[PDB]
Amino acid sequence: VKANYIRAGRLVRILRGPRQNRVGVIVDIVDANRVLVENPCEQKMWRHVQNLKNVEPLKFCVSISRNCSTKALKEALESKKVLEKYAATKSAVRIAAKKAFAESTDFERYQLRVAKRSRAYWARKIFDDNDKKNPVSWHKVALKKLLKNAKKVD
């Protein structure tokens, strides 16, 4: 219903192959569950066959014809600057972040741990002094109930 359509010129990302998490544009369709994928602005990713269970369509499309030249595809990609827009997408940044964590050297892992702890401390300080005025937490709400209850007896 809301799926992106498989067609010539549609960008895809590979799921589980040797070229995992790589992007290329579909150039042709052969039968129901096979296409030809190519990306001329990136190492590897020459024209090759890919099963349709191993790709996911993206939102970006490029105007080309079926069985187009490699130089024609390269020209089309740079004119629309589609590759840059995908890099700015939140899905691409999440994938890039996970690769950066896998390469970490136990000193950058410590640096990330320090950075997260600093944010958590300051969030705690910000949450308080907004609980003193306009109380929202469980304890600060119950403090108003306790004080009013004790007003009559005391």
Partner: protein, 221 residues
Amino acid sequence: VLPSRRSLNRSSRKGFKKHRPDIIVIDLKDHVLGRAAAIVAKQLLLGKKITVVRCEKLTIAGSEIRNKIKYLQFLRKRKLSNPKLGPFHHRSPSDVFIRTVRSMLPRYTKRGQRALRQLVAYEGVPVNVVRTGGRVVIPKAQRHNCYRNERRFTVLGNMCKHVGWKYSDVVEKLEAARIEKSGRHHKKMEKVRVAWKNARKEALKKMPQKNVEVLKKFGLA
């Protein structure tokens, strides 16, 4: 269960108040019966404590007529000379799941009997399980990865009714009450959830300028 005076006295001397073992709670809604039972049985043998809820939402491939006939064939079997010794035909959905798991365990050794003792199998989500923690699912048996869309399937609760189960109305009445209470509570504390979200934001511009950059590099800010 039911601590006697020996247990309460020992806890009083020692100073203990409460204890909770490590337990996994599985929501069995929209799960294939046979595939879920096989995965759970192996985990029981590996030393796990498992509680499964909403056992009336398990699904079986095929039409309701086909599956109802299959149960009526099982019900036909009984020891002719003394039916009170023969096979016992349980009728509740939670009892059917336990019987299915039992047939996938070595049930005539002490090792298998101990493993079967570690499964609870409630119907719906009872009051003592609601606030324990987040529930889990089994992606290998979720029935939207398992069944083709055009194939008819059976819901276990509907099939267990019409063969002897007489608590369908009780279970649906309690489930609807739980949804309203949980929905009302979840709408509450939307202020504290938003306040915490507005605290993590604006925490930046208060942290040192180097820790924010490290957060940006790893895609966390």
